[PDB]
Amino acid sequence: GRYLQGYLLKKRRVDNIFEMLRIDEGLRLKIYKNTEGYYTIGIGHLLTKSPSLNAAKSELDKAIGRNTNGVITKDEAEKLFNQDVDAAVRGILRNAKLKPVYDSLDAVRRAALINMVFQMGETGVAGFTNSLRMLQQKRWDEAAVNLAKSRWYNQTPNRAKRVITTFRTGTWDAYVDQGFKKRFFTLDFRYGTLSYYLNDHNQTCRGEIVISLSSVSANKKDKIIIIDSGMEVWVLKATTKENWQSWVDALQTCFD
């Protein structure tokens, strides 16, 4: 018995605007027609409006320094994301209604505002005048109840509640239970390397951490196990207490 193996849920810690919008908006790698039928990609990145897939592929090809072919990488989507964030921030700072509030907010709540911009557009966010005033005055709890008095809150409830919670607390707590995906893990007892795969079968190794060089933190109540390699952090979640204990004991062997 050289390998401890089995399924576990995995996610990346949501503690920055990219991971947040990745959860809330979504990150697509293949060119997809957005809601208005215009070729889009990554995290709400508008390519153009021409019904020519070749045009979009080229505007996308001019976007990234290569011939994507209607498909991009996650690292690429991020690059388009960072550009869109800068455009969003500048738009906000040039909008007389949003600048004041944005100047008064902290980094985390600022990401929450941008999140709203991505979803409903700058002018749409400027329509929450009463909530904006409250956030500017730092009346967190009151801003939260008002932000909820809107179509947004009723149409996209879950996303809305997460953004509002972020405005209320100034923390990333609304996203702790978000971003989990089922993956198959393999721990090699002989050399101490932990690898994961898309599933039971597939051969392609999607990631790997040398346990003996990482920090392993675990929480039984949440059935969470956090593995920090220094340059990468995996947040894993077991399906039961037995399953959870089996992995924690196995990873603990790398330190006795």
Curated annotation (Swiss-Prot):
Matches recorded under PANTHER family: T4-TYPE LYSOZYME 1-RELATED (PTHR37406:SF1)
pH dependence of activity: Optimum pH is 7.3.
Expression triggers: Expressed late in the viral replication.
Gene3D superfamilies the UniProt entry points to: 1.10.530.40
Record-linked InterPro entries: Endolysin_T4_type (IPR034690), Glyco_hydro_24 (IPR002196), Lysozyme-like_dom_sf (IPR023346), Lysozyme_dom_sf (IPR023347), Phage_lysozyme-like (IPR052619), T4-type_lysozyme (IPR001165)
Localization terms from the record: Host cytoplasm
Any one GO biological process: cell wall macromolecule catabolic process
One protein family per Pfam: Phage_lysozyme
Recorded consequence of changing residue 146 to M/F: 2-fold decrease in enzymatic activity
Role noted for this protein: Endolysin with lysozyme activity that degrades host peptidoglycans and participates with the holin and spanin proteins in the sequential events which lead to the programmed host cell lysis releasing the mature viral particles. Once the holin has permeabilized the host cell membrane, the endolysin can reach the periplasm and break down the peptidoglycan layer.
Impact noted for substituting residue 25 to N: Loss of 84% of enzymatic activity
Catalytic activity reported: Hydrolysis of (1->4)-beta-linkages between N-acetylmuramic acid and N-acetyl-D-glucosamine residues in a peptidoglycan and between N-acetyl-D-glucosamine residues in chitodextrins
Family under the similarity heading: Belongs to the glycosyl hydrolase 24 family.
Name of the protein in its database record: Endolysin
Organism: Enterobacteria phage T4
Effect of residue 131 to I: 500-fold decrease in enzymatic activity
Keyword Endoplasmic reticulum: no
A GO term, aspect molecular function: lysozyme activity
Outcome after substituting residue 40 to H: Facilitates transglycosylation more effectively than hydrolysis; covalently bound substrate
Effect of residue 131 to F: 10-fold decrease in enzymatic activity
Recorded GO CC terms: host cell cytoplasm
Main location group: host cell
Ligand binding (substrate): 46, 118, 131, 146
Statement: the UniProt record of this protein carries the keyword tRNA-binding: no
EC number in record: 3.2.1.17
Keyword field: Antimicrobial, Bacteriolytic enzyme, Cytolysis, Glycosidase, Host cell lysis by virus, Host cytoplasm, Hydrolase, Viral release from host cell
Active site: 25 (proton donor/acceptor), 34 (proton donor/acceptor)
